[PDB]
């Protein structure tokens, strides 16, 4: 009853926390990228102004900024993967519950009409077809009526055909 | 008597649940396809702009999107198969009852 | 490859069509059995009446 709303609230709060933390990490990555671009432009400017040991310091500063940027980017990616895991687990649980409902419905239907009942019904159909064929063959036998004269006048009717011809 | 309506209601509710879940899965597949098309166009654009390691990242992103799309598609197909099983079982039960009635008459 | 999928889809549709067609034919055969049994019973009753008269 009320527990379902509590579960939904807990999942939403966990997603909110994870997304907020990812927002902080993206903000820090943006700041690091800003600093790295500023540092690259500054290094180019002072190399225009003629200094190279300072340029070594500048490229070292850009390198450490790039390293920190990469680390925060990977942390944000991991948080994204865990958000995806939460969503995938919720969807999978709902799908399994739907499949279980369908399985319950089909199980009740198959209990009502089993395969044994189907084979019994078809056996009854074939047996009644046999019986109806027996009755229908009894009443339609030409030897009862059509063959009145079985006499050997096949020669005689041949002669009458010759007469007509 | 009244149990027949309850059975019909239960079957209809089960079909509604399965179709709703299939609707969510089709929506997710549509979103994945949207992302994959966006990613392909983006990769072509930045290869126009001259980068290839980024293109490796882009094709990896498209590959994982395609994998997720395939998985949700197969799940939707399985849900469709189970809906078909429910419908086939209902039709088969009705057919068997009709055949039994005819057998009783004959 | 999509054409392989399409021909597979058509094949399963054809299989389901054949199955429902055979089920309909069996139902037709049972309807025919009901009609034949009614006609045969009426014919036997008529023959019995004639036999009684003769």
Numbering used by the authors:
A (entry chain A): 4 to 168
B (entry chain A): 4 to 109
C (entry chain A): 56 to 109
Sentences from the paper on this structure:
Individual ESCRT-III proteins are small and have a simple set of α helices (α1 to α5) that define the functional core of the protein. We show that Asgard ESCRT-IIIB assembles into parallel arrays on planar membranes to initiate membrane deformation, from where it recruits ESCRT-IIIA to generate composite polymers.
However, after mixing the protein with large unilamellar vesicles (LUVs) containing 40 mol % of the negatively charged lipid 1,2-dioleoyl-sn-glycero-3-phospho-l-serine (DOPS), long filaments were observed by cryo-EM. These filaments have a diameter of ~12 nm and are reminiscent of those formed by eukaryotic B-type ESCRT-III proteins. Filaments were also seen decorating and occasionally interacting with LUVs of various shapes, further suggesting that polymer nucleation is aided by the presence of membranes under these conditions. The polymers are composed of four protofilaments (blue, pink, green, and orange). (C) Top view of a cross section through the filament, highlighting the two protofilament pairs and the interprotofilament interactions through α1 and α4. A comparison with our off-membrane structure revealed a slightly smaller intersubunit distance in the membrane-bound protofilament (~3 nm versus 2.7 nm, respectively). This was accompanied by a change in the angle between helices α3 and α4 (off-membrane: 145°; on-membrane: 116°). This likely reflects the need to form a stable five-subunit nucleus involving i to i + 4 interactions, which then extends by fast polymerization, as is the case for other cytoskeletal elements like actin.
